[PDB]
Design a protein around this motif. Structure first.
Motif, PDB file in Angstrom:
ATOM      1  N   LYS A   1       0.823  -1.208   0.000  1.00 57.82           N
ATOM      2  CA  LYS A   1       0.000   0.000   0.000  1.00 57.82           C
ATOM      3  C   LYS A   1       0.862   1.265   0.000  1.00 57.82           C
ATOM      4  CE  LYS A   1      -3.073   2.969   2.619  1.00 57.82           C
ATOM      5  NZ  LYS A   1      -4.160   2.931   3.644  1.00 57.82           N
ATOM      6  N   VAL A   2       0.392   2.225  -0.789  1.00 62.77           N
ATOM      7  CA  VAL A   2       1.104   3.515  -0.921  1.00 62.77           C
ATOM      8  C   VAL A   2       0.224   4.606  -0.301  1.00 62.77           C
ATOM      9  CG1 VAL A   2       2.161   5.118  -2.601  1.00 62.77           C
ATOM     10  CG2 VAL A   2       2.428   2.670  -2.941  1.00 62.77           C
ATOM     11  N   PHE A   3       0.779   5.281   0.702  1.00 58.21           N
ATOM     12  CA  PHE A   3       0.041   6.359   1.361  1.00 58.21           C
ATOM     13  C   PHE A   3       0.183   7.661   0.583  1.00 58.21           C
ATOM     14  CE2 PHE A   3      -1.405   5.187   5.732  1.00 58.21           C
ATOM     15  CZ  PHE A   3      -0.821   3.903   5.794  1.00 58.21           C
ATOM     16  N   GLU A   7      -2.379  11.621   4.362  1.00 58.44           N
ATOM     17  CA  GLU A   7      -2.953  10.351   4.786  1.00 58.44           C
ATOM     18  C   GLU A   7      -2.014   9.682   5.792  1.00 58.44           C
ATOM     19  OE1 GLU A   7      -3.369   7.136   1.717  1.00 58.44           O
ATOM     20  OE2 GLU A   7      -4.766   6.235   3.166  1.00 58.44           O
ATOM     21  N   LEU A   8      -0.744   9.545   5.386  1.00 59.71           N
ATOM     22  CA  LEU A   8       0.280   8.952   6.267  1.00 59.71           C
ATOM     23  C   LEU A   8       0.499   9.858   7.477  1.00 59.71           C
ATOM     24  CD1 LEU A   8       2.376   6.809   6.846  1.00 59.71           C
ATOM     25  CD2 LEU A   8       3.988   8.331   5.623  1.00 59.71           C
ATOM     26  N   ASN A  39       5.510   3.719   0.645  1.00 62.47           N
ATOM     27  CA  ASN A  39       5.194   2.372   0.199  1.00 62.47           C
ATOM     28  C   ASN A  39       5.371   1.380   1.337  1.00 62.47           C
ATOM     29  OD1 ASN A  39       4.734   0.039  -1.182  1.00 62.47           O
ATOM     30  ND2 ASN A  39       6.407   0.324  -2.719  1.00 62.47           N
ATOM     31  N   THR A  40       4.278   0.847   1.881  1.00 57.72           N
ATOM     32  CA  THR A  40       4.435  -0.091   3.008  1.00 57.72           C
ATOM     33  C   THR A  40       5.155  -1.385   2.640  1.00 57.72           C
ATOM     34  OG1 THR A  40       2.334  -1.203   2.677  1.00 57.72           O
ATOM     35  CG2 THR A  40       2.197   0.897   3.970  1.00 57.72           C
ATOM     36  N   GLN A  41       5.220  -1.726   1.362  1.00 60.49           N
ATOM     37  CA  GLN A  41       5.859  -2.970   0.925  1.00 60.49           C
ATOM     38  C   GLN A  41       7.321  -2.886   0.536  1.00 60.49           C
ATOM     39  OE1 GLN A  41       3.107  -5.341   0.752  1.00 60.49           O
ATOM     40  NE2 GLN A  41       2.067  -4.739  -1.239  1.00 60.49           N
ATOM     41  N   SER A  85       2.851  -4.618   6.356  1.00 58.40           N
ATOM     42  CA  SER A  85       1.382  -4.511   6.316  1.00 58.40           C
ATOM     43  C   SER A  85       0.942  -3.100   5.966  1.00 58.40           C
ATOM     44  CB  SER A  85       0.830  -4.973   7.659  1.00 58.40           C
ATOM     45  OG  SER A  85       1.521  -4.307   8.702  1.00 58.40           O
ATOM     46  N   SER A  86      -0.313  -3.013   5.576  1.00 56.95           N
ATOM     47  CA  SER A  86      -1.058  -1.823   5.173  1.00 56.95           C
ATOM     48  C   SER A  86      -1.340  -0.941   6.365  1.00 56.95           C
ATOM     49  CB  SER A  86      -2.365  -2.221   4.492  1.00 56.95           C
ATOM     50  OG  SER A  86      -1.974  -2.788   3.230  1.00 56.95           O
ATOM     51  N   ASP A  87      -1.298  -1.587   7.517  1.00 56.58           N
ATOM     52  CA  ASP A  87      -1.519  -0.886   8.809  1.00 56.58           C
ATOM     53  C   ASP A  87      -0.093  -0.626   9.354  1.00 56.58           C
ATOM     54  OD1 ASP A  87      -1.066  -3.073  11.199  1.00 56.58           O
ATOM     55  OD2 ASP A  87      -2.570  -1.767  12.038  1.00 56.58           O
TER      56      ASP A  87
END
Length: 129
Positions: A1-3, A7-8, A39-41, A85-87
């Motif tokens: 997931k990309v914030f 948002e972030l 990028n969370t990944q 993770s996305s969280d």
């Protein structure tokens, strides 16, 4: 997931990073921008057999377990996969320990190189927080 940036920023503020240890929200958002580009990944393999994971690129040598880092510790007590993770929660909680480990935010090379001594308040621009 990309914030998205704000948002972030919101997600970080909700997890208590703003002025955490005297480090303003902008610091945290800047660091994330240059460590993983929101990028969370994001993962980056290091030449020392260690790997950096997630939005704040935490290192498998000492903070998390990825099960392939030779003289690795797991101070944060978590699988490095959880940092992908996305969280944001596992990353922020682990980040909180890393920033109190005696080097302040210098633990993050990209923050040191791109945010340190800068107008970090810009990173928070146009965000309703």
């Amino acid at each position: 997931k990309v914030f998205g940036r704000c948002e972030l920023a919101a997600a970080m503020k909700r997890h208590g990073l703003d002025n955490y240890r005297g480090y303003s929200l902008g610091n945290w958002v800047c660091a994330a921008k240059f460590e993983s580009n929101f990028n969370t990944q994001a993962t980056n393999r290091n030449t020392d057999g260690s790997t950096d994971y997630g939005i704040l690129q935490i290192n498998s040598r000492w903070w998390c377990n990825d099960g392939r880092t030779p003289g690795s510790r797991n101070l944060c007590n978590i699988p490095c996969s959880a940092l992908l993770s996305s969280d944001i929660t596992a990353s922020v909680n682990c980040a909180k320990k890393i920033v109190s480990d005696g080097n302040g935010m210098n633990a993050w090379v990209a923050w040191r190189n791109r945010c340190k001594g800068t107008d970090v308040q810009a990173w928070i621009r146009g965000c309703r927080l």
